[PDB]
Amino acid sequence: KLDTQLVNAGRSKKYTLGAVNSVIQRASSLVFDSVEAKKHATRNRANGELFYGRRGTLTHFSLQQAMCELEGGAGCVLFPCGAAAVANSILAFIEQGDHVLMTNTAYESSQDFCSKILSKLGVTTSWFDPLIGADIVKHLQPNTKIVFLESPGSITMEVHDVPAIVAAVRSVVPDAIIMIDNTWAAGVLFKALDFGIDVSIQAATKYLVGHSDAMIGTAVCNARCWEQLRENAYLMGQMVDADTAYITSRGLRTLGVRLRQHHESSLKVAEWLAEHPQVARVNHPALPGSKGHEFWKRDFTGSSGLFSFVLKKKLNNEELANYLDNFSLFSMAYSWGGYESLILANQPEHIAAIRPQGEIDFSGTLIRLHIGLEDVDDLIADLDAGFARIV
Amino acid sequence: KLDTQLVNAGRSKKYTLGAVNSVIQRASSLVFDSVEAKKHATRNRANGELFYGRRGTLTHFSLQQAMCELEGGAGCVLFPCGAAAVANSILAFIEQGDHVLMTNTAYESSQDFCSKILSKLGVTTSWFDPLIGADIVKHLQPNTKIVFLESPGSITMEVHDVPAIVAAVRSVVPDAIIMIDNTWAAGVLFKALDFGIDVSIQAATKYLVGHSDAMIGTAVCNARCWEQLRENAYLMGQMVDADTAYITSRGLRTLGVRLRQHHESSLKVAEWLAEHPQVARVNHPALPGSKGHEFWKRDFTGSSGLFSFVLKKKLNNEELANYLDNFSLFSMAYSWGGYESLILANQPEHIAAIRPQGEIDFSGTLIRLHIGLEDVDDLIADLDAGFARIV
Amino acid sequence: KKLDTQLVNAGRSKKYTLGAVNSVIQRASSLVFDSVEAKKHATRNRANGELFYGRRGTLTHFSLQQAMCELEGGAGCVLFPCGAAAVANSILAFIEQGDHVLMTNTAYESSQDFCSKILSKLGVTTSWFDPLIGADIVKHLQPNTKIVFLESPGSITMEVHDVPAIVAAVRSVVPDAIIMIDNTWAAGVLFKALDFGIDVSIQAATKYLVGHSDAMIGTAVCNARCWEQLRENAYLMGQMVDADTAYITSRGLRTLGVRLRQHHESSLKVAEWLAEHPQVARVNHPALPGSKGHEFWKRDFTGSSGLFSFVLKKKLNNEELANYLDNFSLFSMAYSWGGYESLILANQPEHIAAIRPQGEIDFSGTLIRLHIGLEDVDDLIADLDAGFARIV
Amino acid sequence: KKLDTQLVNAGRSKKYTLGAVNSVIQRASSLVFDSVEAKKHATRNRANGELFYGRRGTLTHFSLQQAMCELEGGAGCVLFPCGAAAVANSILAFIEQGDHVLMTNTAYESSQDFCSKILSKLGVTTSWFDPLIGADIVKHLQPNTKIVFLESPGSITMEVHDVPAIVAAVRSVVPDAIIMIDNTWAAGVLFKALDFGIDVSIQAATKYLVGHSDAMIGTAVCNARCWEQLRENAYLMGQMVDADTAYITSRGLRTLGVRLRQHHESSLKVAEWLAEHPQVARVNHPALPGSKGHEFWKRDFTGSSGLFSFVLKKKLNNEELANYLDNFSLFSMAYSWGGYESLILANQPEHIAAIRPQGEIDFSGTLIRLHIGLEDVDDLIADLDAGFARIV
Ligand SMILES: Cc1ncc(COP(=O)(O)O)c(CN[C@@H](C)P(=O)(O)O)c1O
Ligand SMILES: Cc1ncc(COP(=O)(O)O)c(CN[C@@H](C)P(=O)(O)O)c1O
Ligand SMILES: Cc1ncc(COP(=O)(O)O)c(CN[C@@H](C)P(=O)(O)O)c1O
Ligand SMILES: Cc1ncc(COP(=O)(O)O)c(CN[C@@H](C)P(=O)(O)O)c1O
Ligand SMILES: [Ca+2]
Ligand SMILES: [Ca+2]
Ligand SMILES: [Ca+2]
Ligand SMILES: [Ca+2]
């Protein structure tokens, strides 16, 4: 049962040492009592024995066990933030002459890592429509090494048909590493590894931390891919600090109570918006009619609270300020996943610049909301005062 | 004056806000009061204005200003540890078809990053002897992009002639990026940027933190190289957590009192060892006769406390255990830079495996010591009981 | 304001958050004055949220304090290193040689032991009352009574006071008494103590406000009448909490609503199952009809937390107690409560009798206290059922 | 053992460090018992370094405690949220209605205010003595004296007690008194209080032990005679410090030697320059010949820290005070001390007279207190010289 799992994940006695939570073990240097102990630790340095702080301390091991239990993985590799998890996960499997195939709705810095960093290293990238399903075979090349998914999509929220994509890819390039950015689902609302994906990546910064303070990336790997991701990321010096690891473990405890509120509130806002005279479209995976809703309903076991909607109007600069500057409860900021509700605008032309080898199909201003833990009726009231400012 | 600089570096009122130390600002999301504020922050997102936690908060900005003041740089890029600083600094400047030229005494994982990661990306690496000076021109290729220095060298402690190397490299491949791992000198005992080096990298984990807890890498850049390092590392998601940034700033405060004790103690141990019947050689940059001592004396303004010595004996496994297992005051561990004295052994054949395109010239067991803050006469007593165990 | 929106926003003024969502963490003893004039200004405002000296607080403390005054409707919020320090020092701040303290006999045992072991040797006497005494409290008032100390629900046995009756009765006789409550079970928020004419609402913020069993902190939210005295006398005893703890307590507030609702829903479901169970004598849950003071809870509170107790039909012997407690898979044995993890503790009737001064107990089986956490309620009920099979 | 080696290793047993160099940080209220038997064992040892409940401490606290007993030669180390809480609560733990407390009139002002404002209303009287009274202390002892409270060097004015004389005199008359000292200036280590027959050595660990002006914490290291009473009575008041603060205090110990030596060397160099300066009346530095109790410092201490004061030839008026203090570049205005940053504070003779009960002051110019930090001593002297040019 997810709730019981969340409360206990990673809390082995060897990590908590008489406490409820794991200990916080801050270290670089880790001490070997003897030559024989150093040899034991060296052989087990990637197997949960204390060796050197760059490999982890007890605090890290505890979070790694929790993430493996929650996402059904063989191992969990840690990073200083989600963008570092994305970039280094992809790097760990590529070589000069490879091709990367990425959804055109991937998080922008994931796109930019490929276009700006991988391109100089003899790796080419191309893109696909998130709703392509089994027709992704037209984009597969004999040198396709990575197939990178993000479901729902960044900003626009399109849900992939992961089963269809996975079957297609294994049929043509079975050696491909299939990755997903599974941040929206907090890794627990969509069990990526059970669907044939090799690596489930999170900006743990978001719903796993849950409070908008700490930054951390995770990559949960199947047994086929764990060693290579782990050792190559180690060679790039990737790790997260012990205290952040502790705080992430601690976020897990309330994840189920938080995600149920996020689902209930954001769906009710989405439903209210969908019926509002000033709204063109609502992009929420849980809302019937949204792009790939059917796949959300079949493949996920809940929703989080991030979604977007498109205004009937393309707001001009003065309207955009009147709208966004006068919110009482929604704050303007990047990221999401916390207790506080947030708001961000993107003009159609902003989104057009980040959908390579696609076409946008809306013309009004796109508003993305993260629905936090405030009373939902207060949030709806704030949104409705917003609409009066731009009617 | 270094001491006064250390106490005040980065402590602008905008960062301390009424306290002695900088504030600890934990954040991912950073809030914009208005559209106009978001536009201001966006334009200044790499210029010390609050934008998004991946770019930093006030705590990071404070440490970045301190590191720029201390090392004379245009900018300071932050990483989750030294190995991540090395790997990502080199990555930020390379492209398929480049050559990297690295001292054969570089830190092993720096070697391994090149041999195991860069090699798959169409980048070749070769090596040089640390004492090559101006004859490094024989190793320069028309596609040499990076010249990577580490002075003193890892484990064996050889000091380069940086002036001679730098002049040679600028004369042949002026477009090269010259980097140094300046960890031993804590960035302050050798002012790398004043000698023509482009980027001074530290495992800030070591002497800057000073207490063996926290892990962090720094790269202080000149104005020529700052933008590219900063933006490419950003694309790999490199950052450090706020609290670690705070603790690093805090280590700086005692760095001068610590480094003076480390120098005085370790030189006196080195002198005592050099005269000991059971010692073949002592490798300490401050000790006359050590490899590149003359360059240490001309180019550095002090010593830290890490050095090595070679035993007359190649200890067998039983002797190695009798030696290392029965120390009272020295602990066995990786890393160094803290208050606690540490000891590590390397057999000649271990070092031979990590000196590409060189030759070792010793035959006894090499012992590396980090000399901490304990009474030096107690440490010497512990070393002498050690010698009695293996006579 | 609606609780959940209030919780999210409490304390988060721009002067404390400085561009972030959460307050800054400002760690300091020394706080720097730019000038003689600035120092004079800070000195005047040293108890009024200007930076002065770390013992008085930093911006991190100020934020928590603001949050706590907002949520509990107070003029001020005094901070302490734990619950027990808040209790002991809030009582100390208002007494003097010759005073009498009247305390509920269901008070947390350390609160009792402070009165009987510390206050006694300072010329302050204490006596105790039954938690259901209500209006009849007048019977225990003395000419020198200074403090009337309430705890509702009761420690372990969970009895709810008729607060309206008690407060009216006290004010009718000793209007100038200081009325305090230990309002930890309600998290200060499910029972608005200061709206009921209580002077000081004290919590072990250790519990529900922190919510994760990993920081310790006490709070005392005061009305305007009593704030100064509590604050300044507490300061002379050196009482403060660390900035990092204050930041984590503020943080815990943000999930307090979603957590309390799950604790209510799950704990009531367990309590309802236990009441029907053949091996259970009685269930002590404020929200469960038939428990002591339930109708006062229904009337006076806006919700329940997850802590309650039940009485077994058996008085367990030592071997049965071990076989019961040692073999749980989901409940852990520990003190405290208020966190995400379910906890269990046992007391024998004779242990409880010993901490019920000037009153008698009302049960004879072993008493089991549960903290119902965030685990799936059916897994928890399954673990409790395996427990019962072990002592049939 | 030699101090620097001791400092590095103090508290770092394998049971606390668990493979790291520093102790673990174990954050907890609830501490889990695996069984009834384990709980019974923890309960017996709850004041003896077995995990029991976070109010009693975690492994992090145990480590600090061990370190502090080792460095100060004590049987036990009681922890508090700050210096002022250690003073107030250590005095409280040993008094009862009818007792008398004898305190040096150079005691930290809050220590004085605790006695005169809190203790007075609890039936405890206080009187004061001159710090140089030595053997003549017998003159101020009373049949009901319970505590003799020492502070050496003195707060602000820096007078050093003849501790050997005072202690012998007290023991000759009231052998069962509790003798306490506020040993913060010495960092517990430059004056081994418990070796001189003092019962309790108290510090504001806030200062030199933490060493960076960013955590607050008090300690009281006790002999075997007084440990239990201090510990248990302090516990009934809820006194504890947070685990993270305990970890940072242990951490500060590791650099205490290298820091104190620089504070000694730099502060003595400044003091020697000031004594020769035409605008200075007198220098109050324990290490500087001619200061009050210097010869007791030379005899009894093993070093100096960096805090001292000096008296200007001028009694500065308000405009000269601002022009002096407002325009420093390296010294900052703030309370506290013990950190890496140099600090400056001013007091007028009439402010000091007001906190010197039952004694008189010995100066008439403005009194300037300096904390000499880790900055280059010649830059510091240059900043002080520019200061003098501003009030010529
Ligand atoms: C799906 C997704 N995957 C990765 C990342 C990168 O994580 P880190 O910020 O922790 O490096 C993000 C970041 N997104 C916000 C900044 P926003 O969505 O506001 O741009 C994301 O949304
Ligand atoms: C010169 C030098 N430069 C980089 C690094 C990498 O820093 P991080 O450990 O913080 O990633 C090291 C690490 N060295 C120790 C593990 P050791 O020397 O014990 O192997 C080093 O020595
Ligand atoms: C109502 C109530 N009021 C105060 C305190 C004291 O708070 P601190 O533990 O933060 O000092 C407690 C403590 N209770 C547990 C230890 P337990 O209930 O397990 O004995 C309490 O329950
Ligand atoms: C000797 C001495 N003993 C105790 C304390 C109280 O410690 P805490 O501030 O940690 O509660 C002090 C405090 N002193 C500064 C505030 P200042 O000297 O600047 O007034 C002191 O000096
Ligand atoms: Ca808000
Ligand atoms: Ca040691
Ligand atoms: Ca459990
Ligand atoms: Ca300064």
Coordinates of N, CA, C and O in Angstrom, one line a residue, chain D residues 12 15 29 36 42 68 91 103 133 147 158-159 173-174 216 230 236 255 313 341 359 387:
Chain D
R12 N 35.1 12.0 20.1 CA 35.1 11.2 18.8 C 35.3 9.7 19.0 O 36.1 9.2 18.4
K15 N 31.4 4.9 18.5 CA 29.9 4.8 18.7 C 29.2 6.1 18.3 O 28.0 6.0 18.1
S29 N 13.1 13.5 18.4 CA 12.4 13.5 19.6 C 12.2 12.0 20.0 O 12.9 11.5 20.8
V36 N 10.1 -4.4 24.9 CA 9.9 -4.1 26.3 C 11.2 -4.1 27.1 O 11.6 -3.2 27.9
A42 N 16.8 1.1 28.5 CA 17.0 2.6 28.2 C 16.5 3.4 29.3 O 17.0 4.5 29.6
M68 N 33.2 17.7 26.4 CA 33.2 18.7 27.4 C 33.7 18.2 28.7 O 34.6 18.8 29.4
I91 N 22.1 28.0 38.6 CA 21.8 28.6 39.9 C 20.5 28.1 40.4 O 20.4 27.6 41.6
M103 N 27.4 36.7 44.7 CA 27.9 36.8 43.3 C 28.9 37.9 43.1 O 28.8 39.0 43.6
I133 N 38.4 40.8 46.1 CA 38.2 40.6 47.6 C 39.1 39.4 48.1 O 39.5 39.4 49.3
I147 N 25.3 29.4 47.3 CA 26.1 29.5 46.1 C 27.0 30.7 46.2 O 26.6 31.8 46.5
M158 N 37.1 43.1 33.1 CA 38.1 42.1 32.9 C 39.0 41.7 34.2 O 40.1 41.2 34.0
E159 N 38.5 42.0 35.4 CA 39.3 41.8 36.6 C 39.4 40.3 36.8 O 38.4 39.6 36.7
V173 N 34.7 28.3 55.8 CA 33.5 28.7 56.5 C 32.2 28.0 56.1 O 31.5 27.6 57.0
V174 N 31.9 27.8 54.8 CA 30.7 27.2 54.4 C 31.2 26.0 53.4 O 31.1 26.1 52.2
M216 N 24.1 29.4 19.2 CA 24.0 29.8 20.6 C 23.8 28.5 21.4 O 23.1 27.5 21.0
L230 N 22.2 19.1 39.2 CA 22.2 20.0 38.1 C 21.5 19.4 37.0 O 20.5 20.0 36.4
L236 N 14.0 19.1 34.6 CA 12.7 19.4 35.0 C 12.2 20.8 34.5 O 11.1 21.1 34.3
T255 N 39.2 23.5 16.2 CA 40.0 24.6 15.9 C 40.2 25.5 17.1 O 40.9 26.6 16.9
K313 N 41.3 58.3 27.7 CA 41.5 59.5 28.5 C 40.2 60.4 28.6 O 40.0 61.0 29.6
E341 N 35.6 37.5 13.8 CA 35.5 38.9 13.4 C 35.7 39.7 14.6 O 35.2 39.4 15.7
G359 N 29.8 48.0 45.2 CA 31.2 48.3 44.9 C 31.2 49.6 44.1 O 30.2 50.1 43.7
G387 N 40.5 55.5 14.3 CA 39.6 55.8 15.4 C 40.1 56.9 16.3 O 39.4 57.9 16.5

